């Protein structure tokens, strides 16, 4: 580790991380729905739709093994309620044995095929019931159709949304058992422990993102990476300033110059037990806080209070290391990279107009100190390509413009290789983290031509910022398949005021199914 | 039909040029294996050099002239490179002891030129035509191009060469002279020959569109624009009707009508129709946005970067559709029936304007809550789409300058396309390839649909939460097509060439390729 | 004079090129009577038609029969003289050697302005950058005095030169055909000196602020001084403190670079009949301080240019020290610092004390230039000089008065102002006289200090800033040239190096 | 401010300024800016593209 510098002694010196969550203590059973339902314990919830009939009445098909609940579930009573997506009701009653149980439903709309967005609404409705629940068991009954991946998605989402981050605080009780009834139970059972792993990778990314910039800085974040690597038996290395200077990472170091925290480059490695048939580098943007630098975030809407989210890329790569190091895929060697630093205003900061030199020898004219991410990524990409990998994938809260193009739901992916992009899109489908392919339009490249340096950091004119940033990064990958995932829009959940941990599953699915 | 005026100096029609100087150009295609003759004004070699970047010029063609051949020997030419967009002029006497002009334009090192590359090439060529009084041009192809790229070369040569002087008066260019002859030498030539006149047709469709777009809002208003379409329909023998206010009211087009309430020009709905002879295999509706000026309304375009001085262009989609009608009506494709539609009006500020907050009713009974009067296009398209689907067609394609958000997603080179049907989307992408008007497919993200739920009306015009306007806009439009394959091309970003300060006429070629194949 | 660094990658000096390929060009001026020889390279005729967008007509006799055929009226009339329009063709001459011939249109007005000639040269340069040439020949078929002719050469040299210091084949001969060529020959080497003074200044301005900081900029001035045998003295923070330059020092408090005060002196061999001080604004980067440059249009990314005035003065030092004028003593001054945001920076509201004892209330930390110049002016007057002339990128308001072409000059002395106006005429660097309007003086009355740094009300910023500076010169003829508008060439994305030739002409005549 | 196309006339205004004690200052019509009034479609632009 490294000592975290402090200003006052009340300054925190590490990021608090919960590894052992209540989620891990939930025992999960999956039963076949063809056999009827055991509803004699705790909260039972039916997921029901009504195809054709928009906002139609609720109707429960399943036979249950309790006469009190059976009468409650009869059609005359259930048709008082309707299936409008996310709508729920649940009632407390006494079973045949005079024990207290509760029974309800969540509407799943009138369309048979739930999207991942629809499923998230259902889970949220469920989470709301759980957040005011003190019964020890929850049973979920699927009277709708889902496939394996979506089912795993339902579990992951349920776990992530159920868990609440209390690390910075100074009603309900978490359940100890989860029961699922669904068609083909035996084929779905193997998704349960995968969902548990995907959940914590996501939750772990989320904890790092949510951690404010006084807790989470370049030294504490790199320490946390080291600790993670040690728990997982991963090779690790942290590059400090003297090593970075020797490697000539002038672009990366320029961004960190104004910070009181020393730049830290994180490099973790997973190597498979047997023969290695694919080498991958995963690269994450790691700005622990983006003030904007001298191009200060002062305009309205510029969201400076949320700029602790700017290492979301890093978080997602570390979350992926957790999933990969736990699931242990074969035949693959994976490098997890993040050039971590802080973008600050200081006598020592880099200036608009400065010309700096990347480690590949290119000089760069800085047009805007708030375009800091591509600078740190540029050196990290030159580092990654020197590892001789088959694939470089970077992931980053790179451009606000994503909010205007794809919005808060889909990330953008860009790339120099059609095959790598298709793999990313396939990973998107099976992970249910939606991504959309956007172009790298060469016609814009000329706008990056600097009068003095080898290249401009930004365009003066061209407003398509996400494409222009991609064009810039592209200049630091000579002959390796490379993709870039811009998650500036999708990373932070504005409505719920929390991170999504976007990308952990995307990247994990990418490395698992190649 | 009569255009209302405030004062007698107000224009009552759009000035339109049909017989352009490009049309008087005699074009001949010759096969390169016969060898080039070089007799008169300006012969340009299109030359590349694969592999060797900024490599030397070498003229591979057989030139049937001693003096000119001697001039073009490698030794003479090695001081020149092929860097894309580079040109040189040479001057010499040929065998007939006549002075002659010769040159080249560099086509780079990549053997396959993009459409952006080919455009850079034509632009270079065109500078050699400007400020030089020539009567003939000959172009010798020493690069490889497929038939579609060759056509694109001509379309672009024609379009970029034509200079629009309809509004010049005391300042016409005294030195503007157009060539009368164009010679092209190319390998396997008689294959290419039929591209020439197709190019000429595609050229004018684009230029016609461009002519309506560039025409300012005092010239191009709903009456004059709909008058122009009639005039075009008559010239092409297309069936036409222009629906006026009283019929629009009967059709209950309250969304469309609300946008135009504040204008001194009555709304005019253009409905043109091309029908093949024989069996109609496909029926298609093309729908263009026709806001002849977009001031924003009571949500006035007053913010920095709002581009209110360019908003004469907000009729670009409609112009694209009229330009398509020219090409279709000229080329006469078989087995199709095309409706060309535009709900035309002006979005103005008046005591008679619609206000933010108003609840209006579309022609399919849906009540809409107007959240911003400057999202006027999607309202006029709502009624136009409802009308389109009533025609009972197989495909509805609409094209619009709909969201400035496109400047931040794809920028100024690529249009966006959205839709409810994958096959139709892919046909559009295919047309994009063969028209060489670039389009990228963008998603309609259903999760945002809820942000358009209104507390009082059936639906909101705009989103509360979501800054992804192009997507929200497309979600809104989807609400007005119930059971038909539909696509939506957003051309707000690409319609206007900011660098050249003029229209691109974007989409005419795209839509025509769509209709043709 | 050791340059501090944050990381070991930080640059410790401004790269400078002194030997430019322009200095290896051999220039001949020939009389046009006798006719022009066309034997090699590129020959460009400068042509007008006094008509509008009229045809090109070549008057001069060319001693080559093939090229004469190319230049006959039937052929040239296909081209026109619209200002800046050019054509050139490769062809074989009498000797069957390849040569290129063409023209640059000079429009339809007989006497070209400095702006027109700039446009003509820019067209000429485009041809030079696009053709591998051993030699360029220019034939003057337009009228041009000695000063405009010199201007054509300076501009050609400067625009032809490409600055490559931060990146990771030129002509060897220039021929000039002009009527009465003997009168113009003496301007050639004068042009070469003026060219480099301008290019040198340009090099400092264009160099980014991580390269060009108060220490490396002052080191640069010392290097220059040594090469020219000028006396030099750099005042550091301890000296400046003894001299009590509080306005100057307060601006630089927020920087990691110490304030460095530059003082170069040229003295003539003989008796000194005139003493001059040239004072240049030397802010190596203007972030705006706590009044940060955060507003739309505030151009923070070009604030490396805020040292342009200093650059202008040092470029002059190069010309003066090379051309060695007599009977003058010239002091070259600049109070160099960096205006930054830090826990140490000066604040809005602060009250500071200039070295003449005046207390100043800071109303805006981004009006920093007038505070550093306040102390530089007090310093200069103590030298006992005849003239004080400052040059400064002082007010963005200049963009709204004169725009990007004309600098503004303010002053307390009409004779000095007219000397600058004359120097503007002969150097062809346009300047315009603007008033110091005393009715505005009262808006600078501070409630607490002796004087306000800025007005709260009056938007006539250039005038108020002049009124401010006027308080720090008591008994000396002083003029102030505001080059905020003209210093940076926005279209071309590079400095103009404005001011060097202007100041030099002022010193020389 | 006073602008003009004629030095004699500008001076009559300046002298009228002196004797009427209504202060006027001569400002230049800088011709380099004329090309920014060039219009692509009309004879001339009402306002400038680039000059402030
Ligand atoms: C102001 C622009 C330069 C913004 C972005 C880059 P950014 O690094 O500040 C990024 N952190 C960001 C994410 C989400 C919302 C806003 C900002 C850009 O498009 O370049
Ligand atoms: C709205 C779209 P709009 O209907 O005003 C459209 N006319 C538009 C405006 C601005 C740039 C491009 C196109 C908006 O983008 O504010
Ligand atoms: C005091 C304020 C009105 C700020 C400035 C003066 P400045 O010292 O920052 C000067 N560097 C400048 C030059 C050109 C463009 C902008 C600023 C101003 O607007 O004049
Ligand atoms: Zn930033
Ligand atoms: Zn950032
Ligand atoms: Zn609008
Ligand atoms: Zn509009
Ligand atoms: Zn300032
Ligand atoms: Zn300044």
mmCIF file of C-alpha atoms and ligand atoms in Angstrom, chain B residues 289 291 294 296 301 305-307 311 313-314 372 374-378 401-405 407 469 492-493, ligand 2:
data_model
loop_
_atom_site.group_PDB
_atom_site.id
_atom_site.type_symbol
_atom_site.label_atom_id
_atom_site.label_comp_id
_atom_site.label_asym_id
_atom_site.label_seq_id
_atom_site.Cartn_x
_atom_site.Cartn_y
_atom_site.Cartn_z
ATOM 1 C CA UNK B 289 -40.996 18.026 -42.576
ATOM 2 C CA UNK B 291 -41.564 24.162 -41.552
ATOM 3 C CA UNK B 294 -38.981 27.875 -37.366
ATOM 4 C CA UNK B 296 -39.546 28.492 -32.078
ATOM 5 C CA UNK B 301 -35.084 30.668 -30.379
ATOM 6 C CA UNK B 305 -26.249 28.711 -30.541
ATOM 7 C CA UNK B 306 -29.946 28.506 -31.458
ATOM 8 C CA UNK B 307 -29.161 29.239 -35.140
ATOM 9 C CA UNK B 311 -34.168 28.123 -39.781
ATOM 10 C CA UNK B 313 -33.755 25.120 -43.671
ATOM 11 C CA UNK B 314 -36.484 23.525 -41.503
ATOM 12 C CA UNK B 372 -42.432 23.501 -25.873
ATOM 13 C CA UNK B 374 -40.310 24.851 -30.567
ATOM 14 C CA UNK B 375 -40.783 21.078 -30.815
ATOM 15 C CA UNK B 376 -43.240 21.856 -33.589
ATOM 16 C CA UNK B 377 -42.027 19.349 -36.199
ATOM 17 C CA UNK B 378 -43.103 16.196 -34.382
ATOM 18 C CA UNK B 401 -34.686 18.401 -39.607
ATOM 19 C CA UNK B 402 -36.120 17.298 -36.313
ATOM 20 C CA UNK B 403 -33.552 17.573 -33.479
ATOM 21 C CA UNK B 404 -30.461 19.694 -32.923
ATOM 22 C CA UNK B 405 -29.431 16.792 -30.664
ATOM 23 C CA UNK B 407 -25.176 17.617 -33.818
ATOM 24 C CA UNK B 469 -34.195 14.410 -27.830
ATOM 25 C CA UNK B 492 -31.031 18.185 -38.678
ATOM 26 C CA UNK B 493 -27.301 17.661 -38.374
HETATM 27 C C1 LIG E 2 -35.804 21.471 -31.252
HETATM 28 C C2 LIG E 2 -35.663 20.883 -32.626
HETATM 29 P P1 LIG E 2 -36.337 22.054 -33.819
HETATM 30 O O1 LIG E 2 -37.715 21.679 -34.118
HETATM 31 O O2 LIG E 2 -36.320 23.511 -33.218
HETATM 32 C C3 LIG E 2 -35.348 21.963 -35.348
HETATM 33 N N1 LIG E 2 -35.864 22.892 -36.297
HETATM 34 C C4 LIG E 2 -33.880 22.260 -35.106
HETATM 35 C C5 LIG E 2 -33.496 23.200 -34.152
HETATM 36 C C6 LIG E 2 -32.144 23.460 -33.939
HETATM 37 C C7 LIG E 2 -31.174 22.790 -34.687
HETATM 38 C C8 LIG E 2 -31.552 21.849 -35.644
HETATM 39 C C9 LIG E 2 -32.906 21.587 -35.849
HETATM 40 C C10 LIG E 2 -34.445 21.684 -30.617
HETATM 41 O O3 LIG E 2 -33.448 20.975 -30.968
HETATM 42 O O4 LIG E 2 -34.347 22.592 -29.742
#
